[PDB]
């Protein structure tokens, strides 16, 4: 029998909930194949597996948040000390965004804002082709680059020594990474998609976070082209299962 947790450390948004069901819905749809069994707890709000079950989930899914990495609230502490006996145990552990920062931050690395400032788009990554086995959870023909969809106002400032850097961008060194075989982190959101997306936009304008100007440049990254959804399943999924193509 195969089990994953997904800590979910946001809350469900209106649009998600209405449109998705919510975000576990969306992780499951992402990620999740028939037959197997995903139990999802909202770290954000305190609620935890108990430690002694953690042997029995066969991987973990960290989403990402509107919280900061670098913060101190208790349901972070806890997080990082979870994550930590989880990466003591070798389990597979995929980090997105919030999650790639928060593994990042166990092992010793430093999460703040972006030096570039905030991303709200659909964007490319450049993948550092040298450090990608043909074959593997990247699998045969590794793209030069890969679409993803970027929602963040935080990155990795000093990364782990242990981590391997495996794409970065012009403005953001670090947009994915692998630590040993077990930790697999994204900058990005291979979950979101352009409705996802478009709702955080308006509602970020709506607040007078962003001018009008930004929130049409994040849109009009949207407007003739997609993420590459496929094969970032195809990656999660590799990874996260130990498939191997």
Request: charge should be negative; charged fraction near 30%; aromatic fraction near 12%.
């Amino acid at each position: 029998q195969k089990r994953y947790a997904l800590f979910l450390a946001t809350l469900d948004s209106e649009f998600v909930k209405k449109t998705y069901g919510g975000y576990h819905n969306v992780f499951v749809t992402t990620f999740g194949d028939e037959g197997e069994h995903w139990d999802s707890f909202r770290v954000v709000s305190g609620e935890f597996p108990d430690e002694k079950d953690l042997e029995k989930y066969d991987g973990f899914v960290i989403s990402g948040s509107s919280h900061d990495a670098f913060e101190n609230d208790d349901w972070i502490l806890k997080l990082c000390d979870i994550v930590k006996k989880i990466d003591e145990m070798k389990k597979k552990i995929l980090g997105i965004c919030f999650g790639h920062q928060i593994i990042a931050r166990v092992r010793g690395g430093t999460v703040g804002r972006a030096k570039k400032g905030p991303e709200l788009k659909l964007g490319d990554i450049t993948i550092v082709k040298d450090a990608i086995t043909p074959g593997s959870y990247f699998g045969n023909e590794i793209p030069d680059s890969i679409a993803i969809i970027k929602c963040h106002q935080d990155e990795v400032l000093v990364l782990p020594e242990t981590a391997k850097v495996l794409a970065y961008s012009k403005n953001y060194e670090v947009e994915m990474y692998s630590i040993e075989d077990h930790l697999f982190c994204i900058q990005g959101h291979p979950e979101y998609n352009k409705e996802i997306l478009f709702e955080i936009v308006d509602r970020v304008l709506a607040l007078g976070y962003v001018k009008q100007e930004f929130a049409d440049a994040a849109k009009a990254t949207m407007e003739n082209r997609g993420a590459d959804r496929k094969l970032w399943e195809t990656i999660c999924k590799n990874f996260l299962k130990g498939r191997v193509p």
